[PDB]
Nucleic acid binder design. Structure first.
Ligand SMILES: O=c1ccn([C@@H]2O[C@H](CO[P@](=O)(S)OP(=O)(O)OP(=O)(O)O)[C@@H](O)[C@H]2O)c(=O)[nH]1
Ligand SMILES: [Mg+2]
Lengths: 340, 913
DNA sequence: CATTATCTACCGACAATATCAATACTTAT
DNA sequence: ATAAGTATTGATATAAGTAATAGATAATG
């Protein structure tokens, strides 16, 4: 019987470092019914959940009261929030750890060295049934962390060495609009192509009525996202938030060449492919004209391209005899001194 | 041919003067042709090489490189002449309404008038030369930044145009192109070159592993992401980079501003001096109208004449390339192995085994960082080898001829040559090559001083003069061995701190040892009076410290005391006890701390160095000896903490003067002028701050700190939209940089002033004098006279208290300012209250001061639409309640100047040695 | 009065762009 | 009597270990 903290307690915490959480139990019950987590993790009495950036710890209490997993690790390294978690969930079967989840080392130490949290690695054909990760990365400055966590899916390195672990991610509405843009929308950028290539992600709930104007209309109809007012998050200053369920999928491209090609095409994301393939090295336009056979594709500006066209273009790039060096794609900011 | 050897062969000085006059006139004509015909001569040289290569065969070699240059030029001239043709066909406008909305509307009608003014072949050759010269600059791996390239080419074409105009004006008997037009012109020309340049390349196809050869564009326009902020780049094919690390690069890309063979145009006005046709301003004013405006006012008033005297003495000193050292460096370069600094031939970098993807993210990040480190090291070595190649080619050009360097000043007043590539103020190799053209007999003092210089080079500048002479005497065998065969020997000169100058002086000493009477020998090698903590010397003199002056060799002593060594020892003792205590950080570093490591932190520390800077400075200094991670800064963090702890106690007068300067800079930066502005800018209640720190050099030169908040904007070009800043936009001052920069600029101004005074005096005595900011060079004979002059001029500079004169000058220049006042803390004087009112009548005459000031109060958002309103509002504050007040700027009170006769340095021989 | 976004001593030096949301402005119908 | 570009401008995203680093610290609400 985990005691859930309400608005009274979480009104007392003065510092939040910029993170906005949710406190209404009714919308959380609605969300956990919409997600229907009891379909994949059919035996929760064996599931182990790793909660990053839990903060106030209401989602955690409701999750535990509804599913009773075996191990629930809240990684919150912040003074007032850690104090809150140890004064409210003391002795409770929740596992409260004072560890920064931002640094990569935390996961290596926890799973590898100390073996406090040891989940079970499974194949890469079905979405993992014994490991669920939930995260609240809602700071307006801490958005690059989400990009790192998405990139880890491509390398299969950080927590995705246990297969396809499903993530329940709270994120700023601007990040959710970037990640969930469909080809040709205004907010389509390389973050969206990464999301499309590695993941299929659905909008489980949003914190605003006038935000649905940034997502694709057919996709907004397909997802059927839960809505709530801006009076539901407790620190009511920052922009609205959006919860996104993110499960990795299969992929068979070369992630390094795909990164290069996508990053250098999505710089000039509105010049037609007649003239944007020259930024990919020396002599790119002549070669990519001699190789690309479908001259309808040459008129799609690289914002119009789906991910399959990017995989095709990276296939042509890796077939290029005179392709440039992909590894020296940086600026020597460190010590290009230029003495003479 | 070789002028220097025959000139030295002459027995009598009058014959030398006749020889010098004849060479001077013939070199007048030679220099005159050199400036104008540099591009024509270079273009003729490579077209000739292309024709010569054609007969032999077509292989990818240096002659092929010249062939490529003549091919790019040959296939770029028609494009640019078609552009010019459409420019003249469209410059006859009819109606500016129905025009090509992109290609002519902003593009062609805008730069139209500027393309007609200069003939096309000049523009093509200039674009090729100026794009090759920018190879691997601005942070790009093997290319350039697009902004730097576009602006440099536009500026080179404009300056060549202005040279054409100067030549036409002397023969027959815009003013400053805006940044936007320069950008558009540069972008159009480099675009055409991008669209013509093609170089053959060889590649390996992936599926069949069968080599395939093809022609690809030599230049390419791309982008690169750093830190999220995209950057435009121009990449050059690696096949061309392989050929830029080649011996014949100087023929392709000619240096226009190289040391002139005639006497520099002696400085008579800020607008003229040194170079004949390329105008050179007396100030390297980076991006300021105010700096040039104040310099112009000074020059018109003419009160800086001493700066002209110093620059004219600095410039009229003749050098000559050392033939023997050139031979040794050429042998070492041709050998191909990595020498002391010449890194050595390298084909392509090798990276460690790539880590598997499934590895922890930190491991991949660490590998990526290592890849960045390896790439940086490779590009650094490649750049060093290329720079050395350029320097050796210029040295080869002048193997016999004597050369003069025209000096210029940065905005403080330190003298920097005008020739950027090759000058005596570069790294050690450049200094080794150069020797004084005029040779003077050593004499009794001269021989000993030459020996003391050789001891100085070997790192034994710490010990007294007698010990230096003893050290030189003890190693006579090493001197003869090193002199006889530079290589294939003991190579004693190599161990020295300064590797090349040491061999050159070894050659001089070997010649001296072969003479029965050393004094009759005539020497060329300049002796360096280096200065021990010169900034500290100036702080001690200004403050008037006695203990501080004693530490810094000001007061006469038998043994030289250098502050760096003393603090380094103190830090060493404390670190040793710390390592014994039990920390592991100190044990590794307990011994390595030496004078060199501490000196950088101590100098910067007096000057207001933020802790991050100290951490990096120490990391770089201690990286070679390999006592901690050269890449990492974590190990170095503690060391700087202790350095600061030991240092803080040491300094009192320097800290007082630096603090006063910082407080004065902050108050002056945050001040608002009454007179110029009678209108509120209406940006807000608080106007902008456009007043900058300004003081005058003791010589009379004006110094104006150009630390503004620059406003860049994206101007559109043919290639991209470049983020450049327009120099004419005056903007508010960056208070942070003013406060952090006043102390170093003041001390550097004083240092440069002392140099210019001593240079004028030495040139008056007839001694050639060359000075690298804080070390003065002269023949080993006249070194004694120079030693006397240095001290004397220091006296003539510090006889008057300079900080007080500076504060008085500040109070004069900034009396009628009104610093914005926040909520009150206390009161200082009793004229603040009269400032707000300005109701005292000003009848029958000037003293308008109240009239101009009262209207400014109306701009302080008064409580009115009236007259007695705001005055009543402020009565409460003095009587209590804080307001954002308008108080008169009041500069602080200068620190108490301790009693110490500066005139006691006249008898200290370790002051400069 | 409580809380935060810049830099990291100074000089020779030498720099983010593409896109689009919207504006004042000239055209003109 | 009656509207659509449009040169200028300003905001926003960009990659993604807080630029190769992390403690002050001037400066808003
Ligand atoms: O990083 C620096 C280095 C040097 N300088 C300034 O350049 C001048 C001399 O620079 P250096 O001669 S080499 O270093 P010194 O402090 O003179 O040590 P030394 O006594 O020669 O063994 C001197 O005015 C110094 O303040 C800086 O301002 N910043
Ligand atoms: Mg010195």
């Amino acid at each position: 019987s985990v005691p859930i903290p309400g608005i009274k307690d979480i009104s007392k915490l003065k510092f939040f470092y910029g993170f906005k959480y949710l406190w209404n139990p009714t919308v959380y019950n609605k969300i956990f019914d919409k997600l229907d987590l009891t379909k994949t993790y059919k035996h929760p009495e064996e599931l182990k959940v790793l909660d990053l950036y839990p903060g106030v710890g209401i989602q955690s209490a409701i999750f535990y009261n509804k599913y009773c997993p075996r191990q629930y690790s809240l990684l919150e390294k912040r003074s007032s929030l850690y104090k809150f978690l140890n004064a409210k969930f003391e002795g409770s079967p929740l596992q409260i750890l004072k560890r920064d989840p931002y640094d990569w080392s935390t996961y290596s130490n926890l799973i590898d060295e100390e073996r406090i949290f040891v989940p079970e690695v499974q194949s890469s054909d079905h979405i993992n049934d014994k490991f669920l990760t939930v995260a609240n990365v809602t700071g307006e400055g801490s958005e690059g962390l989400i990009m790192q966590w998405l990139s880890c899916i491509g390398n299969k390195n950080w927590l995705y060495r246990f297969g396809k672990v499903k993530m329940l991610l709270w994120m700023p509405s601007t990040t959710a609009r970037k990640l969930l843009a469909r080809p040709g929308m205004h907010s389509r950028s390389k973050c969206s192509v990464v999301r499309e290539a590695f993941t299929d992600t659905k909008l489980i709930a949003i914190s605003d009525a006038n935000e649905l104007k940034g997502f694709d209309s057919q996709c907004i109809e397909e997802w059927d996202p839960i809505l709530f007012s801006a009076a539901e998050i407790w620190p009511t200053k920052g922009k609205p938030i959006a919860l996104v369920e993110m499960d990795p999928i299969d992929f068979d491209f070369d992630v390094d060449n795909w990164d290069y090609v996508t990053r250098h095409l999505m710089i000039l994301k509105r010049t037609p492919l007649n003239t944007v393939m020259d930024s990919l090295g020396h002599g790119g336009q002549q070669y990519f004209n001699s190789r690309i056979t479908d001259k309808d594709l040459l008129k799609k500006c690289p914002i119009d391209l789906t991910n399959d066209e990017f995989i095709y273009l990276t296939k042509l790039f890796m077939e290029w005899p005179f392709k440039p060096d992909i590894l020296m794609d940086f600026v020597d900011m460190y010590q290009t001194e230029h003495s003479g | 041919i070789n002028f220097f050897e025959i000139y030295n062969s002459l027995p009598t000085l009058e014959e030398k003067k006749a020889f010098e006059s004849a060479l001077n006139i013939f070199n007048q004509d030679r220099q005159k042709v050199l400036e104008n015909r540099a591009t024509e001569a270079a273009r003729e040289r490579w077209k000739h090489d292309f024709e010569e290569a054609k007969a032999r065969g077509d292989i990818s070699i240096e002659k092929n490189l010249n062939v490529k240059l003549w091919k790019w030029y040959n296939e770029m001239l028609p494009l640019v002449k078609e552009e010019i043709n459409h420019c003249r066909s469209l410059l006859s406008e009819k109606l500016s309404d129905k025009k090509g909305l992109n290609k002519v509307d902003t593009n062609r009608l805008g730069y139209g008038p500027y393309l007609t003014l200069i003939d096309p072949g000049k523009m093509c050759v200039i674009t090729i030369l100026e794009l090759l010269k920018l190879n691997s600059t601005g942070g790009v791996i093997e290319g350039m930044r697009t902004a730097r390239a576009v602006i440099s080419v536009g500026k080179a074409i404009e300056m060549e145009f202005r040279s054409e105009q100067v030549l036409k004006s002397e023969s027959q008997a815009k003013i400053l192109w805006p940044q936007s037009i320069r950008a558009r012109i540069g972008s159009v020309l480099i675009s055409m070159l991008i669209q013509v340049a093609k170089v053959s390349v060889q590649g390996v196809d992936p599926v069949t592993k069968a080599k395939v050869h093809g022609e690809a564009p030599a230049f390419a326009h791309g982008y690169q992401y750093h830190n999220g902020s995209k950057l435009g780049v121009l990449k050059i094919h690696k096949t061309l980079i392989r050929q830029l690390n080649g011996e014949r690069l100087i023929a392709s890309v000619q240096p226009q501003l190289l040391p002139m063979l005639v006497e520099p145009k002696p400085w008579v006005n800020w607008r003229s001096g040194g170079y004949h046709y390329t105008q050179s301003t007396l100030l390297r004013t980076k991006d300021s109208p105010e700096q040039v405006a104040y310099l112009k006012a000074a020059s018109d008033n003419g009160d800086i004449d001493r700066v002209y005297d110093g620059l004219n003495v600095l410039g009229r000193t003749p050098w000559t390339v050392n033939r023997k050292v050139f031979d040794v460096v050429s042998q070492v370069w041709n050998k191909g192995e990595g020498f002391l600094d010449i890194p050595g031939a390298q084909d392509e970098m090798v990276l460690p085994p790539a880590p598997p993807k499934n590895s922890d993210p930190s491991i991949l990040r660490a590998w990526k960082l290592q890849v960045k480190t390896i790439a940086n090291k490779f590009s650094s070595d490649r750049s060093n080898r290329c720079d050395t190649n350029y320097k050796l080619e210029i040295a080869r050009a002048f193997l016999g001829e004597k050369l003069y360097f025209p000096h210029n000043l940065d905005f403080r007043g330190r003298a920097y040559p005008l020739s950027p590539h090759f000058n005596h103020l570069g790294n050690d190799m450049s200094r080794g090559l150069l020797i004084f053209w005029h040779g003077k007999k050593l004499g009794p003092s001269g021989l000993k001083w030459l020996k003391i210089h050789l001891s100085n080079l070997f790192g034994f500048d710490k010990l007294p003069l007698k010990d230096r002479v003893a050290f030189t005497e003890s190693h006579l065998q090493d001197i003869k061995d090193s002199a006889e065969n530079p290589l294939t020997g003991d190579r004693w000169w190599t161990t020295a701190d300064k590797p090349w100058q040491a061999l050159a002086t070894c050659f001089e000493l070997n010649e001296v040892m072969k003479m029965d009477n050393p004094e009759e020998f005539i020497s060329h090698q300049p002796v360096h009076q280096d200065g021990t903590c010169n900034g500290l010397q100036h702080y001690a003199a200004l403050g008037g410290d006695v203990e501080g002056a004693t530490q810094v060799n000001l007061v006469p002593s038998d043994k030289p005391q250098d502050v760096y060594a003393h603090v380094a020892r103190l830090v060493q003792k404390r670190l040793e006890i710390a390592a014994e205590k039990g920390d592991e950080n100190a044990k590794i570093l307990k011994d390595k701390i030496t004078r060199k490591v501490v000196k950088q932190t101590v100098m910067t520390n007096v000057y207001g160095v933020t802790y991050v800077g100290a951490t990096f400075q120490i990391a770089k200094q201690l990286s070679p000896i390999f006592d901690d991670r050269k890449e990492s800064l974590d190990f170095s963090k503690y060391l700087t903490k202790h350095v600061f702890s030991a240092i803080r106690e040491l300094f009192h007068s320097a800290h007082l003067i630096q603090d006063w300067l910082g407080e004065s800079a902050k108050r002056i930066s945050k001040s608002i002028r009454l007179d110029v502005d009678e209108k509120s800018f209406k940006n807000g209640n608080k106007p902008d701050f456009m007043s900058s720190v300004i003081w005058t050099t003791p010589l009379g030169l004006p110094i104006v700190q150009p630390y503004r908040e620059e406003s860049k904007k994206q101007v559109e070009t043919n290639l991209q939209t470049v983020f450049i800043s327009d120099p004419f936009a005056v903007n508010p001052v960056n208070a942070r940089r003013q406060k952090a920069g006043l102390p170093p600029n003041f001390i550097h101004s004083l240092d440069a002033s002392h140099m210019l005074l001593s240079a004028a005096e030495c040139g008056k005595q007839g001694l050639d004098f060359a000075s690298v900011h804080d070390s003065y060079w002269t023949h080993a004979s006249d070194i004694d006279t120079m030693n006397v002059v240095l001290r004397e001029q220091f006296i003539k500079l510090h006889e008057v208290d300079l900080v007080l004169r500076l504060k008085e000058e500040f109070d004069q220049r900034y009396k009628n300012y009104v610093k914005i006042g926040k909520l009150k803390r206390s009161t200082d004087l009793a004229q603040k209250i009269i400032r707000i009112r300005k109701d005292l009548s000003r009848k029958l005459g000037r003293s308008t001061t109240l009239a101009d000031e009262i209207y400014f109060e109306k701009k302080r958002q008064e409580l009115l639409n009236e007259d007695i309103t705001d005055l009543d509002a402020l009565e409460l504050e003095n009587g209590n309640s804080g307001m954002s007040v308008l108080l008169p700027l009041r500069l602080p009170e200068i620190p108490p100047k301790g009693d110490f006769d500066v005139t006691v340095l006249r008898n200290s021989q370790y002051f400069f040695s």
